Amino acid sequence: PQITLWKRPLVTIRIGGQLKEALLDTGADDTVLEEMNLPGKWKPKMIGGIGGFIKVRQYDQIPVEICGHKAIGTVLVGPSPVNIIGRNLLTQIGCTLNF
């Protein structure tokens, strides 16, 4: 589809079979999720943006479906106010910026 930027580009994703709302974020290298209790091994990581760094848990090879387009890769879980879909998964769904 085509997603306009008049409002935050929030879309429904499925991860762990849960449905969530998440921000399509061309400025994010990573995919960062609101705290959720995913099973599996993880590695600690620190990621940064405006305001500083937060501690997150890195889970690998997690399926994430984005408006019906399937992806699989790394998701970082921790105390973010918003679920963010970053470039690692936006590339997998063939997302471009256009103007």
Ligand X SMILES: CC(C)(C)NC(=O)[C@@H]1C[C@@H]2CCCC[C@@H]2CN1C[C@@H](O)[C@H](Cc1ccccc1)NC(=O)[C@H](CC(N)=O)NC(=O)c1ccc2ccccc2n1
Contact residues for ligand X (CB under 6 A)? 25, 27-30, 32, 47-50, 80-82, 84, 86
40 binds, among its own copies, ligand X, none (CB under 5 to 8 A by kind): none
CB atoms within 10 A of CB 62: 18
State yes or no: is 25 an active-site residue.
yes
Total length of the chain: 99
Exactly one of 25, 29, 30, 60 is catalytic; which is it?
25
Give the pairing type, strands 10-15 and 18-24.
antiparallel
DSSP assignment, residue 41?
-
Q: Which residues bind its own copies (CB under 8 A)?
A: 1-6, 8-9, 23-29, 32, 47-54, 67, 69, 80-81, 84, 87, 90-91, 93-99
Q: Which residues are catalytic?
A: 25
